[PDB]
Amino acid sequence: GRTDLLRLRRRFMRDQEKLSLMYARKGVAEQKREKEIKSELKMKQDAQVVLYRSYRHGDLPDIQIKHSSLITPLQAVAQRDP
DNA sequence: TCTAAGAACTCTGATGTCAGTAGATTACACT
């Protein structure tokens, strides 16, 4: 960090009261942020996905696919439906 | 011709004491 030591330029409140209001205002916004991000993580937990092969595009079907690109999804389904 | 008022002692039960233990309350503090 040797070039960046400007970051040690700082000053601090002396009202412990105002500083507590900063942490109360941060604390209420955090309490809402916690609830809404949990509610979003509920929605997105059910809906998250991943793709096991990469795809090309063109005027024709890209027939010359690697063995890898069939065997990876063939396992990825068998991993997942009995 | 005797029946209670006055002792006396021990014992029981509460109140306050000390030392030590540990919990919950209250301050202190985050940039």
Give the technique used to solve this structure: cryo-EM
Nucleotide nearest A12, CA–C1', reads B31
As ranges, strand B nucleotides with an atom below 7 A of a protein CB are 29-31
The tokens for A63 are: 């027939």
- Quote the CA–CA distance of A58 and A48 in Å, as a whole number: 28
- φ/ψ of A56, rounded to 5, equals -100, 170
> Residue A20 CB closer than 7 angstroms to strand B?
yes
- Quote the CA–CA distance of A42 and A51 in Å, as a whole number: 21
Residue A15 burial (C-beta neighbours within 10 Å; 0-12, 13-18, 19+): exposed
